[PDB]
């Protein structure tokens, strides 16, 4: 045979990480005394309707003064649906959450009434113990999830580019993850280090930029430049096995790596971005 070893390397990269199933829980958070908007109520109902095999819950907090007025508003609006409000205090692992370093900052942030900044922390704690899919009340459910399985047990959206930043960022919503996922844990570790270091920058706390940085440490290929570098290395490796000029191709027609070979190498990192065909992101936090 010829090129059978090179074709074996390409096939190894396609299934290097087996896809792990995701628990069928849709976690959504709405904490504070502000009432949920009419749009977010309709999107939440649409979320539960499009996922009858998922149990959809909206997580509120009873440790915030004035929470009853907003919680009473949600129950009357969701009493005839599959949306079941669950208090984070009444969780079956709340005593373990109190022993988490991030929960002290969660308590410290809700006291300052920075509810959106606190939601970035709680969503990772819920995915740590229970797992499943976190989604925000503003995220639009395009189609139902069904049985989802992701390489490394982690599913995210396509990364966006901040209009002034220099690095892309994966949104921290929606996030699909297995129970006690390494990417979720590393995001919590970086979040604790940022809060320990008094990071006044809201981006360098528990938001998408921190979730992205933790995703790159566990799965370095998620960085577009890293995967692109890996494709250029296979291009040179194929030329060496072909006994062709060991050089980077000048034009596209001179590339030896076929499109099918590029797709095989990129298969794991495409699947991790699989949540983009199920959910459309909302911009409620943008207007805030
Ligand atoms: Cl060979």
Author numbering: 15 to 302
What does the paper say about this structure?
The respective glycosyltransferases are important virulence factors such as the Clostridioides difficile toxins A and B. Here, we describe two glycosyltransferases of Yersinia species that have a high sequence identity: YeGT from the zoonotic pathogen Yersinia enterocolitica and YkGT from the murine pathogen Yersinia kristensenii. The catalytically active domain is the Rossmann-like fold domain, which features a 6-stranded antiparallel β-sheet flanked by 7 α-helices.
In order to characterize the mechanism of operation of these proteins and to shed light onto their architecture, we initiated crystallization trials with different constructs. sYeGT was crystallized in the absence of ligands and in the presence of UDP-GlcNAc and manganese chloride. All protomers show clear features in the electron density map for residues 258 to 267, so that they could be included in the structure. Superimposition of the ligand-free and ligand bound sYeGT structures showed no major conformational change upon nucleotide binding. Residues 257 to 267, which are resolved in the ligand-free structure only, form a loop that connects two helices of the 3-helix bundle. At the C terminus, the last resolved residues (294–301) are covering the empty nucleotide-binding site in the ligand free structure, while they are pointing outward in the UDP-bound sYeGT structure. In the ligand free structure, Asp-298 stabilizes the covering position of the C terminus over the unoccupied nucleotide binding side, as it forms a salt bridge with Lys-53, a residue located close to the uridine base binding site.
